[PDB]
Each structure stands twice: as C-alpha cells, then as structure tokens.
Amino acid sequence: PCPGRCICQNVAPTLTMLCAKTGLLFVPPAIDRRVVELRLTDNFIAAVRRRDFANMTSLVHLTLSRNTIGQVAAGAFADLRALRALHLDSNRLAEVRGDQLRGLGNLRHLILGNNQIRKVESAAFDAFLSTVEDLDLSYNNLEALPWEAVGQMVNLNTLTLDHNLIDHIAEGTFVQLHKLVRLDMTSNRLHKLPPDGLFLPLTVSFGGNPLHCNCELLWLRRLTREDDLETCATPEHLTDRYFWSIPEEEFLCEPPLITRQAGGRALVVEGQAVSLRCRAVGDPEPVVHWVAPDGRLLGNSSRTRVRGDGTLDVTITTLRDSGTFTCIASNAAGEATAPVEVC
Amino acid sequence: PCPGRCICQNVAPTLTMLCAKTGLLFVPPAIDRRVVELRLTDNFIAAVRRRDFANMTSLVHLTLSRNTIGQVAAGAFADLRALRALHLDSNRLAEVRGDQLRGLGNLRHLILGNNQIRKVESAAFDAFLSTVEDLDLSYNNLEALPWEAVGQMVNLNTLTLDHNLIDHIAEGTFVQLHKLVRLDMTSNRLHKLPPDGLFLTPLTVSFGGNPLHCNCELLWLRRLTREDDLETCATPEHLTDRYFWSIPEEEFLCEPPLITRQAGGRVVEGQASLRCRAVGDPEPVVHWVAPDGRLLGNSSRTRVRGDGTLDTITTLRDSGTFTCIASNAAGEATAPVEVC
Amino acid sequence: ETPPRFTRTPVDQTGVSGGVASFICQATGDPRPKIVWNKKGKKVSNQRFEVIEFDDGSGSVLRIQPLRTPRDEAIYECVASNNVGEISVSTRLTVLREDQIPRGFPTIDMGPQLKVVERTRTATMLCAASGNPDPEITWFKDFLPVDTSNNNGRIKQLRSERGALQIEQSEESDQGKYECVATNSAGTRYSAPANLYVRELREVRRVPPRFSIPPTNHEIMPGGSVNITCVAVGSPMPYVKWMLGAEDLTPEDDMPIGRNVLELNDVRQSANYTCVAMSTLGVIEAIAQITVKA
Amino acid sequence: ETPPRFTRTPVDQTGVSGGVASFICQATGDPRPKIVWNKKGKKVSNQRFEVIEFDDGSGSVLRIQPLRTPRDEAIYECVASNNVGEISVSTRLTVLREDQIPRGFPTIDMGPQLKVVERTRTATMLCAASGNPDPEITWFKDFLPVDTSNNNGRIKQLRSRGALQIEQSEESDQGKYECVATNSAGTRYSAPANLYVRELREVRRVPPRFSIPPTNHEIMPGGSVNITCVAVGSPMPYVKWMLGAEDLTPEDDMPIGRNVLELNDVRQSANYTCVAMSTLGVIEAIAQITVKA
Ligand SMILES: *[C@@H]1O[C@H](CO)[C@@H](O[C@@H]2O[C@H](CO)[C@@H](O)[C@H](O)[C@H]2NC(C)=O)[C@H](O)[C@H]1NC(C)=O
Ligand SMILES: *[C@@H]1O[C@H](CO)[C@@H](O[C@@H]2O[C@H](CO)[C@@H](O)[C@H](O)[C@H]2NC(C)=O)[C@H](O)[C@H]1NC(C)=O
Ligand SMILES: *[C@@H]1O[C@H](CO)[C@@H](O[C@@H]2O[C@H](CO)[C@@H](O)[C@H](O)[C@H]2NC(C)=O)[C@H](O)[C@H]1NC(C)=O
Ligand SMILES: *[C@@H]1O[C@H](CO)[C@@H](O)[C@H](O)[C@H]1NC(C)=O
Ligand SMILES: *[C@@H]1O[C@H](CO)[C@@H](O)[C@H](O)[C@H]1NC(C)=O
Ligand SMILES: *[C@@H]1O[C@H](CO)[C@@H](O)[C@H](O)[C@H]1NC(C)=O
Ligand SMILES: *[C@@H]1O[C@H](CO)[C@@H](O)[C@H](O)[C@H]1NC(C)=O
C-alpha cells in the first residue's frame, strides 16, 4: 500500500520511503508509522501540518529538501523522539519557533539552509541543546541570533552561517564548544569580530563582510592565516583593500573627542525637569556613560534616560545630592571626559 | 587600471572585465566607461549605486549573479542604452521598480531568478517591452504580476515563473505574444488556468506543482492531449492528492449556486444594507440589479462587498424590486428582495 | 438557374480601437452564391481580417480584430456572385478611440463567463450592457451571429417575462466561444469572449430535500448542555443549518452538507430550535423541543 | 637560611555561581618557598581549578572558574615551605547562587572594554561597580593581581571610579585584564578585556589653527550669504558654527577641517562664531554679518 509514484521498501529493519519529483502537494497521509527513513525531496509541499508526522516514533532521518514549505505547524515534530537528522533546506521558512522544534530529543543534525528565516526564537533549540552536533542556517535572512543558545551546544562541531545579514557575534559564546571545528561567517554584515577563541583543528571563515579596519581587528591581523579574500569596507583609506595585504601599522583607532558639551555649568533650583547633552566622535564611535555626584553610573532606569546620541534626561530631581555630573566617552583608543556642575 | 585578482583586457574595441570570486564588497570604482562586457559573479556586493554604472554606454553584458545585492538605487542602470543582457539572479532584491530599469532600451535578456521579489511595479518593463526575448522571475515571492505589461512583450519567447506564490494569471494575456515558445508556471498557488491560447512554432506550458481545484473550470484542459507533467489536484476532498491526468473527465464536477441567506423581502428612507450569500463550486459571484437598470457597486452612491452585501444615502423615491444574481460556472441563482 | 438575392446585408458600424467589428452578409441563388469582401475595390487581405463562412454556405462574416484606426476606417462591400449573376452591397466602418468615446456609448457592465453544461440540459450566458440610449444586444458564437430572432426555438434571448442568452436542450454543436455585442445609434462594443462546454449527460435522479433523521425533543437541567442531530438527504444533497426562530445559528463558512449537529451550552431557558435543509429543489424545516426540567 | 614568612595571605571570599574566585598567596624565605594549595587536606586537582604562579616565584594564585555550588564551597589552605620550614594559612570559600544574591551585593555597572595603546604611551581601563556598602575595586591581569599598592609607579589606580591607569606602556602590559568588585557582602568579577600594545608611531601633534578664518560680509536685507571656515592641525580639528552661546549647526556630523555656513533671509545684523576643536585645543573666530539699507 504505497502512495502513487513513490518508491517504498518495507523490508526490516530499514523501512524506507522515497518521493523525489512526484509532484506532491501535501505530505502523504496514512504513511506507515514504523518508518525509519523518510525522504520527500523535490516536490511542491506548501505547508507542514501536525498530522503529517504524528506518531512516527521510529523515524530517524527526515528529508524535506527542495519544496515550497512556507509554514510548519506547532508541535509538528512533537513525537519524533528517535529523529537524528532533519533537513528543511531550500524551502520558504520565515522563522524558527520553539513550539515547532519541540520533542526532538535526539536531533543531532539540523539543516535549515537556503530559506528566508528572518528570526530564530531564543531557546528554540531547547529540545536538543546537549545532543546537536551540526547546525546549518546558511543562505537566510538572519540579522540577529540567539547566541546564548548556541553557547550551550556542547557537542556542536559544525556551525554554518554562509549567507545572512548577521551584524555582530556575541563575545561570550563559543567558550564551551570544545568540539567546534568549523564556523562559517562568510557574507554577512560583520563590521568586526570579537577577540574570542577564534584562534586554535578549527576553520573560521569571515570573508565577504563589510569589515571596519581599525584597532579592533588588529588582534586578528596579527594571526597567521591564509588569505580567504577578506576585504575592508571602512574607512575610506582602506576601502576595497584586501585585509591580509594591509600592514599592521595602518589599522588605526582615533581617540574620543566630546564635541557637543553642556558647557560646563547648569542650575535648576526646583523639581522642574532638566536635560543634558553629550556627543562624542572618534574611531570607533565612542560610548557615552554618565555618572551621578555619588559616583554612581546612571543607566536606563526610573526617572533617568540615556539615548544613542548620549543625551541624559532626568525628570524629577531631588536636589538633595548636588554635585558634578561627569560625561565619559569611552573608546578603544582612549577616554574623554566633560564634567558639568549642577546644584 | 585593473583591480587585483581580476582579468581585464582593455584592447580596443571590445573591453572585457571579469572579477569572479574575488571577494568584492562594492562595484569596482574607475571602471573604463568604454567597457563592453562586465562580469561580477560570485562576490559579496551588498547594493547597487547609480554611480556604479554611470556612463557605461558601451556596456552590452552586465552580470551580477550570486551576490547579496539587496538594494538597487534609482536610475542605477540609466545610460545603459547598449545593454542587451542583464543578470541579477541569486540575490536579495525585494521589488522591481520602474526607476531601477530605466534606460535599458536595448535589453533583450532579463534574468531575476532566485531572488525575494515580492512585487513587480506595474509597467516597470516599459523601457524594453518591445525588445525583450527572455524574462526570468523564477524562485521569488511573487503572488501577483503586471500581466498588462507582459501582454505587450511581443518579441518575448521564454517566460519563466518556476517557483513563486502566484495566485492567478490574467486571461487576456499572451494573445499578441506570437513568438512565445516556453511558459513555466510550476510551483505556484494556481487553483486554475484560463482557457487561453494555451493549446496551439511549438509550445511548452508547464503548470505542475499547483494546488489545482479540479472542477468544470479545468475540464477544457483535461480534454486536451498533453504528456503527464506530474500535475496533481488539491481540492476538492474527493480528488485530493490525486494525479490530474489520471482522473476521468466525468469526475470534474461543478455545483450550481444556492443563495442561503436572503433578506427575506424586507427602510428609514433617509439612509442605506442588503445581504446576499451564495454557495457552490466554484464560489458564486454576487451581482445586484436596479429596477430598470444594472446596479454597479464599489462606487460613489453604491457599495458592494466580497460577501455580496449591498451598502450610502437612500433616495426618497427609488424603490423597486432589487434582485440579487449569483453567477456561477454551473448555473445562476436569483433571490429578489423588495424594499421601500 | 437563379441569380443571387440578398437575404441579409451588413450595416454601418462604429466600434472602438482594439475592439471588434463584424459584417454579416447572406445571399441565396442557384447555384449557391459565393461571397467576396472588398476594401476600396481590392479583395481584403490582412492579418487582422478574417472571413468566416456560415455552415450552410448562405454567406460569410468579415471579422476585423483588433480594430486599428484609421487604417480600417473605410468602405467595405459584399459581392455575391455565381455563374448567372453578380450583385453587391456596401457599408462604412467607423473606428473611434477612447478619447472620442461619448457618454452614452455602449459599455459592457458584465460579460459572459465560463460555462459547462450537460447534454440536453439548459445553459445560460449573461450579459449586461449600458448606454444612452439603451443598446440592443446580439450574440456571436465562434465569430458567427447567433440567430435568436426566432422567439420559439431552443435558443432564445430574454427581454420580457438583461438580454441573456438561454440555450435549451444543449447539444455538442453548442460547444464554442460566445461573445456579447451591444449596439446603439452611437456605436458598437463587443464583450470579452467566453467558452461554453458541452459534456455528456449524467443521469442523476432529482429528489427534493427530505429529513432522514429529523431533530428529536430533548430535556435538560438548567445549565445545561445538549447535542441535537439533524440529518437531511436528497439529490442534490441539502445544506443543513440551524436557527433560533428568526436568527441563524450556523455560519455560512462552516455550513455542512447533509448532517448538522448543534451544540448547546449554559441552557438557562426553554426554547424552540429550527433546523433548515436547503437545495435547489426545495427548503424544508423541522423544530426540536428544548425544555428546562429540574 | 630563613624560615618562610607570609607576605600576602588569602581572605574569606564569597562569589557567585558560574563566576570566579581567586586566592592569592605569597611568601618569602631562604631558600625560596614553594606554595601548595589544598582542599579538605588533599592537594587541589580539578579541571576548573588552576594554579597560577607569580613571576617573582614569590607565590601562586588559586583560580576557580566557573564557580560550582556547593562542590567548591569548602575550606582551602595555602602551605608555604622551604628546606628549613613549613607554614600554612587556611580560608573559607562561600559560593552563592543568583537566587541567594542579596540586595547590595556588588554589581558591575560598567566593565573594561577592548583597548589598544602604543608603546611608551598611557592606557586606561575603566570599571564601575555598585553595591551596598560601596565595594572596593581591584584588578587582575592574566589571572594575576595587578600591583597598584605603589602609588608612584607606571601602574596606578585612581581614587574617588577606580580605573586602572597604565603609563609608559611596554610589551609586558599586553594581556587580558578583568575587574573585581569586593565588599563585606561578597565578590563579583567583570568580563575580561584585552589590552594590545603596538609599536610607537611618531606623529606630530599641533593644536588647531585657522588656515582660512571667516571673513566679514555685508549683505542686502534678506539676504543670503555663504561663510567659509577652514582649520588645520594634527589631529585635524572638527569645525562647527555658533550664534554666541548656542550652536547653530545642531544634529550634524561635525566636518573635518572645513565648515561652510549658509545664511538665508538675513533681516538683522549679527556676529557668527566659528569653532574648531581637537584633543589639543579649542580655537574660535567670529564673522560680522551686517544688513545695510
Ligand atoms: C536606553 O533606552 C533607550 C530607549 O528608551 C535606547 O535608545 C534607543 O537605542 C537604540 C540603539 O541602542 C537606538 O537605535 C534607538 O534609536 C534608540 N531609541 C530611542 C527612543 O532612544 C538606548 O539605546 C538605551 N541606552 C542604554 C545605555 O541602555
Ligand atoms: C470593493 O471591492 C473590493 C474587492 O475588490 C472589496 O475589498 C474586499 O473587502 C473585504 C472585507 O471588507 C475583504 O474580505 C476582501 O478581501 C476585499 N477584497 C480583496 C480582493 O481583497 C471592497 O470592500 C469593496 N468596497 C466596499 C466599500 O465594499
Ligand atoms: C561684532 O563684534 C565686533 C567686535 O568684535 C563689534 O564691533 C565693535 O562693537 C563695540 C561696541 O559694541 C565698539 O566699541 C567697537 O568700536 C566695534 N568695533 C568694530 C570694528 O566695529 C560688533 O558690534 C559686533 N556686532 C554684533 C551684532 O554683535
Ligand atoms: C501511537 O503508537 C501506538 C502504537 O504504535 C498506538 O497504540 C497509539 O494509539 C498511537 N497514538 C495515537 C494517538 O494514535
Ligand atoms: C456533544 O458534542 C461534543 C463534540 O466533541 C462532545 O465533546 C460532547 O461530549 C457532546 N455532548 C453530549 C452530551 O453528547
Ligand atoms: C415550541 O412549539 C410548540 C408548538 O409546537 C409551542 O406550543 C411552544 O410554545 C413552543 N415553545 C417555545 C419555548 O416557544
Ligand atoms: C551657497 O552654497 C550653496 C551650495 O548648494 C549654493 O547652492 C548657493 O548658491 C550658495 N549661495 C551663495 C550666496 O553663494
């Protein structure tokens, strides 16, 4: 009882079903739940319903490559506890939620390459954090990534992000990934790389990125690596220049200079709202921090706000603690300070 | 003045420049404007600026395949009057605007395959409607298409839409496209195909991988003699997952329209609503009529909804028998209502 | 032998550019007259110009599509001739453009749509035309005029007791491409074409809706939950819905076929629930007594 | 010969789980004392336990990371010994978890960031810690404590923001630094930050100087004029415009060396101030704009 145009082998132990190029519109219903291998490549499946892989507790390999799957229902893989590998490459997935990958206790290979995944839910890999050995998210639309989840994947040895829009890689990641051998960050939006355990075998590819070539990449330039056609995008002096062709001396950082100060003096005698401005400039762009007269750094909390520009806004002043509100512009090449004295 | 790892031969007149797999981040500046062929495949170009191809009036082949191009600036291809072929396949384009394809007067090959094109601006092909012989929009996110523009492309011979979300194809199209030899409509959301000049120097029309609704509206197609391209039905339930050419003609059934919720013959004489919903296969179309004229909806004084509801300000003396007409491929249904 | 005589001669048309213009010309004689179309003296010869002869051979129709102005704006003549005669009649074709289209010029509000009918059954193709004054409506099947002048044939055109085309007792010959034509003193406009298909007769029995399992009377305690079953049958199969007197309880999205089980919750008062079965052959009802007993 | 004497002994620590705990132990004698760390009597031996010896050979530092509670919550002792002696000191390790962290426990508001300094120049690593009471701040370079006890050395710690200031940088200063906040409540480590030392690049430093100062322009009532202000120097000045006290070119990215001001609808005479800024000086120049009948 095999569905039309499909090739099914029901000889124990490996019950295999193959449906390549059979023009499927849906996942074949009433498929034998004792299936071990399932391959549905090169069809035209639009969506994956929960009913599709309901009771397949014997399934270990699932391949859904090259379809038009644009939607995967919640808990669609909830009962695939024996599943080792999952292939959803070359489809139309737009996101990866936790309720979709629930119950994949034995998942060791996860391939989601060549999709349009815009966002991966934080801790959507919870079902297989300790087991996963291979994760592919290449050729998607990821600008961000739940690195905190990645940092827990101990048995991970190959992580590929060949073509996305990832802006930055978290620094604390990759510290416990001792089995990691391949990390691909080619073709993203990486301006810089953190001084992590990049150096070690290990293959870390980071070509095709809009690298900002200042001091923040000096540590990497000092390494002894083969030219993987890495190229700088900024600053203008080094635009279109090959990374490893540039001498270490030309990776320059510029100290912070506070251009727009409060002017060194301010005064409000009552509860009326006050506001201070602080804007720094340098390479890389300095980070502005404010301090209270008590020497306490002020953050994004109640009654006090800080913006990307650097402006400090305080709504209800006590005035019981009047002193010098200092502005600190931290930078890789130095610090700048512009104090203001209020009462 | 050739960039590293690039092969550029500047021997007049045919200036060729090739920069494949050189890890480019931008389109190389100071490219000789008398260049005839320019190929920049397999790099990492993020965007196309208008300054990139400013005065390249000698360029005839431009290849930007397999990058991460997500944005094309307005008038980026202006002054490319000598351009015959354009390759933008395997990129991140999200739309095709008119200001992007401006000035491609001699364009005969346009390949935009494997992108994320969600919408093509109507008449964005105006610069090269009469010249185009090849148009590729395969593997994108198109649910709609400027068919009115496509219908004017006379010299077009190959139109490919291999993998999109196209819901419906216009009926009047393809009547003037006499040189058309290949049309690919595989893997879309097509429920049906119109009885156009599909049947016919040869012609190959592929329409597999669609959620076909198998009723009378495809009977004309089933009667044809074509090879099995693995076409499959999705609806109705009786014919779900069944191969198209395997179903006998008698099983393609249409059900006549039945008006379920009439008004009942049922006001304020100072302000306007009437209900009409039919049901059948395919889903009936509701039309309203005036007592002595044909009522038109979606207008200034009269509005009509997809449900069939007739909706602004009633006239003190335009009372008569307002009849509701439910048109369908298998028949018509009529439920008149008389209001005052 | 007998020299040709005209049975129908074409008239002056005024269509729009890109549209259609058809000239009907018929004659009779012994032997049968052959009809040739001429433009400015010469026999018509163009890609957009096609001559379609009637199946009887009583004449032909000169079809021009799409209309190009003013390359076509001229005088066309019909010349019927045999071995024993040769006569002619001529008419003028005017082709306007959208810029010159007057208010009151015929406009197709709704044209004919795709239709599929079984053999020996009745098929109807709709057409709604507007204009000032009211345009007359004619029909064209496969580039030839449909004769509905005879009000007493299987093929009729409704006007009294919407100039739709009604085709009774369908036969395979009725299968073809139909198009509606609106003509007044201002001009002539064609509607979009629509195909009519004739499939074989599916001998099915016609039976009005009948309740196989009508709703039973149920008693329940205050809040309160009960399921009521209503089953109807017939060909075609009835649409079963639920009502509480006047208002509908079932949505037309979920509306079932042949079987509808109504679910009640928080029943705090006794009521009567009406079950309705609907088909194109009838509408039947049935009430179920729901009471709230302790 | 001389029996061992403790120069620095570890104290009772109270860190958080997953964090860090370092025990410093130094001694002196003749011959050199060797320092061994013990937990519950036996010599420490664990993957998360590393012993880092000082460059002087004056002792070592027991580093525990990451802190696991309560597997590490025990009593650790330092045993210094030579050929003529054997002394010991023992301390208590307390390891809390996030559930048990009291309000007032040290929290790193701002940790040290990546910094690159040229040789023989001054580098500064920032650290801002909060808590109740006010926590004192110490520093750790490559798992070893930074010696800032000498208030008059190249390496100092600023009083009050206890940042670490490294003067006259040398290659030995290149390493991994981490900030430590400790009060009576406990101890919290900041994230590590790398300091890199590159060679000295001799560049000339010249304060901002107006190469092309603003000219005085006369104009017809409303009224439009362009004023050019150009400054030079190393580093290159950021040029802006003001109308007396308030800035006239707000929300713009301050251009480098050149700023051309555009005036429109001039209906009253005024003085416009051009300002050039660098880390080496701030110069000004005013242009007199008048409205003649
Ligand atoms: C504090 O909160 C504000 C928002 O209330 C943050 O401001 C945004 O920050 C991002 C980048 O960090 C900018 O792209 C947005 O434009 C900002 N929006 C607004 C309304 O300000 C700010 O980043 C936070 N700052 C800190 C130090 O936490
Ligand atoms: C005029 O026509 C359009 C359809 O062409 C109506 O738009 C529909 O509105 C309903 C809900 O109000 C939606 O369910 C449909 O999806 C809409 N149609 C389409 C194609 O998207 C529109 O409402 C009509 N105007 C008025 C006033 O009724
Ligand atoms: C702009 O600045 C100049 C001087 O820097 C002003 O001109 C002087 O004004 C004082 C009194 O205000 C006079 O004593 C001087 O004789 C003036 N000197 C010259 C050269 O004019 C000028 O008034 C200022 N203009 C404005 C609008 O503030
Ligand atoms: C799943 O598997 C077992 C046997 O394979 C069966 O007893 C069980 O009913 C199935 N679960 C469901 C919900 O049908
Ligand atoms: C009524 O139908 C619903 C359908 O699931 C069911 O849950 C419920 O138990 C039924 N109640 C009775 C009294 O049969
Ligand atoms: C329901 O119908 C019966 C008549 O058949 C009527 O006597 C009764 O009053 C009705 N019950 C209600 C609640 O209306
Ligand atoms: C000032 O500079 C701008 C630059 O666009 C120019 O348009 C304008 O004509 C100039 N005005 C004068 C008075 O020079």
Q: Decide if B210 touches A, using CB distance below 8 A.
A: yes
3-state DSSP call for residue B148?
A: helix
Alpha-carbon Rg for chain D, nearest whole angstrom, is 29
* Cα(A244)–Cα(B158) distance, integer angstroms: 46
CATH number for region A254-342: 2.60.40.10
Q: What is the 3-state secondary structure (H, E, C) of chain D?
A: CEEEEEEECCCCEEEECCCCEEEEEEEEEECCCEEEEEECCEECCCCCEEEEECCCCCEEEEEECCCCCCCCCCEEEEEEECCCCEEEEEEEEEEECHHHCCCCCCEEEECCCCEEEECCCCEEECCEEECCCCCEEEEEECCEECCCCCCCCCEEECCCCCCEEECCCCHHHCEEEEEEEECCCCEEECCCEEEEEECCCCCCCEEEEEEECCCCEEECCCCEEEEEEEEEEECCCEEEEEECCEECCCCCCCCECEEEEEEECCCCCEEEEEEEEECCEEEEEEEEEEECC
Token pair 């002096």 is at which residue? A237
Q: Decide if A50 touches D, using CB distance below 8 A.
A: no
Token pair listed for D187: 């101890």
Q: Decide if D114 touches A, using CB distance below 8 A.
A: yes
CB atoms within 10 A of CB B301: 10
CB atoms within 10 A of CB B122: 14
Token pair listed for A31: 């498929």
Report the helix count and the strand count for chain A, using DSSP H and E.
2, 25
3-state DSSP call for residue A322?
A: coil
Token pair 């981040």 is at which residue? B25
Residue pair D180/D187 in contact by the 8 Å Cβ criterion: yes
Token pair listed for C160: 């009294």
Q: Please name every residue paired with A211 in a beta bridge, in sequence order, or none if there are none.
A: A232
Nearest alpha carbon, ligand 4 atom 1: A55
Contact C130 B329 (CB under 8 A): no
Q: Please name every residue paired with C86 in a beta bridge, in sequence order, or none if there are none.
A: C81
CB atoms within 10 A of CB A197: 14
Q: Decide if B10 touches A, using CB distance below 8 A.
A: no
Concatenating the DSSP letter of every residue in A196-207 gives STT----EEE--
3-state DSSP call for residue B150?
A: helix
Tell me the ligand closest to D284's alpha carbon.
3
Phi-psi category of residue D18: left, alpha or beta, with phi > 0 → left and psi -120 to 50 → alpha: left
Residue B260 host element (H or E): strand B255-261
Token pair listed for C106: 């015929």
Token pair listed for C118: 């079984």
Contacts of C115 in chain B (CB under 8 A): 329-330
- Indicate which of D109, D115, D130 best probes the interface with A, i.e. most A CBs within 10 Å of its own CB: D115
In sequence order, which ranges of A6-143 are alpha helices (DSSP H)?
A: none
Contact A233 B4 (CB under 8 A): no
Cα–Cα distances in Å, from A248 out to A215, A220, A221, A252, B316? 9, 10, 7, 9, 88
Q: Are strands C259-265 and C247-248 parallel, antiparallel or unpaired?
A: unpaired
Q: Please name every residue paired with D188 in a beta bridge, in sequence order, or none if there are none.
A: D181
Q: Decide if B241 touches A, using CB distance below 8 A.
A: yes
Residue pair B325/B289 in contact by the 8 Å Cβ criterion: yes
Residues 6+ away with beta carbon under 8 Å from D168: D120, D121, D122, D154
Q: Which CATH number fits domain B255-338: 3.30.420.10, 3.40.50.720, 3.60.20.10, 2.60.40.10?
A: 2.60.40.10
Token pair listed for B15: 């200036």
Concatenating the DSSP letter of every residue in B12-26 gives SS-EEEE-TTS--SS
Backbone φ, ψ for residue D200 (5° rounding): -70, 120
The coordinates were experimentally obtained by X-ray
CA-nearest of A328, A329, A314, A219 to A275 is A314
Tell me the ligand closest to C269's alpha carbon.
6
Residue pair A196/A173 in contact by the 8 Å Cβ criterion: yes
* Cα(C179)–Cα(C63) distance, integer angstroms: 13
3-state DSSP call for residue A245?
A: helix
Residues 6+ away with beta carbon under 8 Å from A236: none
Q: Decide if A151 touches D, using CB distance below 8 A.
A: no
Distance from the Cα of C128 to chain B's closest Cα (Å) equals 7
Residue pair C37/C51 in contact by the 8 Å Cβ criterion: yes
- With vertex at residue A77, the alpha carbon angle to CA A72 and CA A82, rounded to the nearest 5 degrees, is 150
Residues 6+ away with beta carbon under 8 Å from C4: C27, C28, C29, C33, C80, C81, C82, C85, C86, C87
Token pair listed for D161: 């923001």
List the single residue in A259, A295, A299 with the smallest CB-CB distance to D238.
A259
Exposure class string for A160-182: b at 16+ Cβ within 10 A, else e = bbbbbbbebbebebbeebeebee
3-state DSSP call for residue A119?
A: strand
List the single residue in B172, B256, B258 with the smallest CB-CB distance to C239.
B258
Nearest alpha carbon, ligand 2 atom 13: B306
Contacts of A31 in chain B (CB under 8 A): none
Contacts of D174 in chain A (CB under 8 A): none
Phi-psi category of residue B209: left, alpha or beta, with phi > 0 → left and psi -120 to 50 → alpha: left
What distance in angstroms lies between residue A55's CA and the mean position of ligand 4's atoms?
A: 6
Counted residue by residue, chain A has a size of: 343
Q: Decide if C158 touches B, using CB distance below 8 A.
A: no
Token pair 């397949």 is at which residue? A56
Residue pair C24/C89 in contact by the 8 Å Cβ criterion: no
- In one-letter notation, the amino acid at residue A63 is T
Distance from the Cα of A333 to chain B's closest Cα (Å) equals 27
* Cα(C23)–Cα(A9) distance, integer angstroms: 67
What distance in angstroms lies between residue C278's CA and the mean position of ligand 2's atoms?
A: 28
Q: Decide if A3 touches B, using CB distance below 8 A.
A: yes
Residues 6+ away with beta carbon under 8 Å from A11: none
Token pair listed for D222: 């409303």
- Indicate which of B249, B258, B286, B307 best probes the interface with C, i.e. most C CBs within 10 Å of its own CB: B258
Edge-to-edge strand order for the sheet containing C21-30?
Answer: C2-8, C21-30, C59-64, C49-53
CB atoms within 10 A of CB A297: 16
Largest CA distance in chain B: 86
Q: What is the 3-state secondary structure (H, E, C) of A139-169?
A: CCCCCCCCHHHHCCCCCCCEEECCCCCCCCC
* Cα(A176)–Cα(D66) distance, integer angstroms: 11
Residue pair C8/C63 in contact by the 8 Å Cβ criterion: no
* Cα(B191)–Cα(B207) distance, integer angstroms: 10
Token pair listed for D248: 């006239």
Alpha-carbon Rg for chain A, nearest whole angstrom, is 27
Q: Please name every residue paired with C231 in a beta bridge, in sequence order, or none if there are none.
A: C213, C259
Token pair listed for D280: 């080496």
SS3 content of chain C, % helix, strand, coil (to 5): 0, 55, 45
CA-nearest of A235, A204, A118, A216 to A165 is A118
* Cα(A283)–Cα(A298) distance, integer angstroms: 24
Cα–Cα distances in Å, from A246 out to A218, A237, A252, B264, B317? 11, 11, 12, 84, 87
Cα–Cα distances in Å, from D8 out to A157, B97, D20, D78, D217? 44, 74, 20, 11, 73
- With vertex at residue A68, the alpha carbon angle to CA A65 and CA A71, rounded to the nearest 5 degrees, is 100
Looking at residue A82, the DSSP 8-state letter turns out to be: T
Residue pair B337/B322 in contact by the 8 Å Cβ criterion: yes
A309 Cβ inside 6 Å of ligand 1: no
- With vertex at residue C263, the alpha carbon angle to CA C259 and CA C265, rounded to the nearest 5 degrees, is 175
Q: Decide if A217 touches D, using CB distance below 8 A.
A: no
Contacts of A248 in chain D (CB under 8 A): 198
* Cα(A9)–Cα(D4) distance, integer angstroms: 79
Among C229, C254, C260, C263, the mutation site with the greatest number of ligand 5 atoms within 8 A of its Cβ is: C263
Note the Cα C175 to chain centre separation in Å. 13
CA-nearest of D288, D293, D170, D135 to D225 is D288
Distance from the Cα of B42 to chain A's closest Cα (Å) equals 10
Backbone φ, ψ for residue B158 (5° rounding): -135, 115
Which chains border C (3 or more CB–CB pairs < 8 Å)? B
Token pair 């073509």 is at which residue? A163
Distance from the Cα of D253 to chain A's closest Cα (Å) equals 9
* Domains, in order of start, for chain C: 2-98 (2.60.40.10), 99-199 (2.60.40.10), 207-292 (2.60.40.10)
Q: Please name every residue paired with D95 in a beta bridge, in sequence order, or none if there are none.
A: D15
- Indicate which of D47, D196, D251 best probes the interface with A, i.e. most A CBs within 10 Å of its own CB: D196
Nearest alpha carbon, ligand 6 atom 13: C271
Is D in contact with A (3 or more beta carbon pairs below 8 Å)? yes
List the single residue in B22, B208, B243 with the smallest CB-CB distance to A4.
B243
Contacts of B165 in chain A (CB under 8 A): 70
Cα–Cα distances in Å, from A238 out to A233, A243, B47, B147? 7, 9, 19, 47
Tell me the ligand closest to B309's alpha carbon.
2
Note the Cα A49 to chain centre separation in Å. 28
Contacts of A333 in chain D (CB under 8 A): 115-116
Looking at residue B258, the DSSP 8-state letter turns out to be: E
Token pair listed for D108: 């790193």
* Cα(A119)–Cα(C227) distance, integer angstroms: 45
Which residues form ligand 2's pocket by a CB distance below 6 Å? B 298, 303-306
Residue pair B123/B99 in contact by the 8 Å Cβ criterion: no
Q: Decide if D196 touches A, using CB distance below 8 A.
A: yes
Distance from the Cα of D68 to chain A's closest Cα (Å) equals 15
* Cα(D110)–Cα(D129) distance, integer angstroms: 7
Q: Decide if C241 touches B, using CB distance below 8 A.
A: yes
Q: Which residue of A has its CA nearest to B28?
A: A240
The answer for A 213-232 residues in CB contact with B (under 8 A) is 228-231
Residues 6+ away with beta carbon under 8 Å from C3: C29, C82, C84, C85, C87
- Sort A46 into a burial class: Cβ within 10 Å, 0-12 / 13-18 / 19+: buried
Closest ligand 4 atom to A34 CA:
5
CB atoms within 10 A of CB D146: 18
Omega before residue C214 within 30° of 0, cis = no
Residue A220 host element (H or E): helix A218-221
Looking at residue B207, the DSSP 8-state letter turns out to be: -
Distance from the Cα of A139 to chain B's closest Cα (Å) equals 10
Closest ligand 5 atom to C225 CA:
13
A55 Cβ inside 6 Å of ligand 4: yes
Distance from the Cα of B158 to chain C's closest Cα (Å) equals 24
